[PDB]
């Protein structure tokens, strides 16, 4: 079970440098190659680069996307079992989800399994954090649908839970929308039995980490 976990700032200003860490478990970074791939909102996968392991002889110590070579640097610390990405001269075109990747090559380059992290969204913008506002969503077959709307936040990373995770059946958290205002919004809903409408209480817990604002709304 190889585990790749990305960490770093979710918001960065233009012209600054993006610095991301990847913690690697279950794969030796001394022998195995590891790198970075990225995916801009609505765009396709774009190879960022790789730092080579000891396994495959006769190659460069790193390989980078020529489109980014002047700005990119990938390093690693095998003692901490960590990989590091640095990207200079940032532009809004660098806004993307960054995935740490690992390889299990044996005999030649890219002959082995490819492991993926969960990805971390980095947003390149000169704006600052905007906390969300959590409004209810209730209205009037045998079941009823309720939820709450997370409005006008920035940057995009936001999470929603229901009754502190105790409720997972019938819950759905939708993807976000970017309004022309430049801010983001999403909604989260759950289907419950009509009876529970007057028996149990349902609160949603919203979290904007980039603003450290954790809110709890009742319905």
């Amino acid at each position: 079970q190889v585990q790749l976990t990305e960490s770093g700032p979710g918001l960065v200003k233009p012209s600054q440098t993006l610095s991301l860490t990847c913690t690697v478990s279950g794969l030796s970074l001394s022998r195995n190659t590891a790198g970075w791939v990225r995916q801009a909102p609505g765009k396709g996968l774009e190879w960022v680069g790789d730092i080579s392991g000891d396994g495959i002889p006769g190659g460069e110590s790193e390989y980078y996307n020529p489109v980014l070579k002047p700005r990119v640097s990938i390093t690693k610390d095998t003692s901490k079992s960590q990989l590091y990405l640095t990207l200079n001269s940032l532009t809004s075109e660098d806004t993307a989800v960054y995935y740490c990747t690992g390889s299990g090559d044996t005999y030649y380059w890219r002959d082995g399994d490819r492991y993926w992290g969960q990805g971390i969204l980095v947003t390149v913008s000169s704006a600052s954090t905007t906390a969300p506002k959590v409004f209810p969503l209730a209205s009037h077959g045998s079941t009823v649908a309720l939820g709450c709307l997370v409005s006008s936040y920035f940057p995009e990373p936001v999470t929603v839970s229901w009754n502190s995770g105790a409720l997972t059946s019938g819950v759905h958290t939708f993807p976000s929308v970017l309004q022309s205002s430049g801010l983001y919004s999403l909604s989260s809903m759950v289907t419950v039995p009509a009876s529970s409408l007057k028996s149990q209480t349902y609160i949603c817990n919203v979290a904007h980490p980039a603003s450290s604002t954790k809110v709890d709304k009742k319905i």
């Binding site: 080579s52 002889p57 006769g58 190659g59 460069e60 090559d105 005999y107 030649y108």
Partner: protein, 61 residues
């Protein structure tokens, strides 16, 4: 150009080629070394070796 195109230790084979060079590429697999013979001078992947030459039937050993 006339180049060898036989694999590893198989019987020798030849082929005509518009290119100027012949190549012998080699890498490791689970039992030993695989060798690929052809024409042109391809770039190779890390972990793969290659030797190119520019005469007829120069990529045998």
């Amino acid at each position: 150009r006339i180049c060898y195109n036989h694999q590893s230790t198989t019987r020798a084979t030849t082929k005509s080629c518009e290119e100027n060079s012949c190549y012998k590429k080699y890498w490791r697999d689970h039992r030993g070394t695989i060798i690929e013979r052809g024409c042109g001078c391809p770039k190779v992947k890390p972990g793969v070796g290659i030797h190119c030459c520019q005469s007829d039937k120069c990529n045998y050993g």
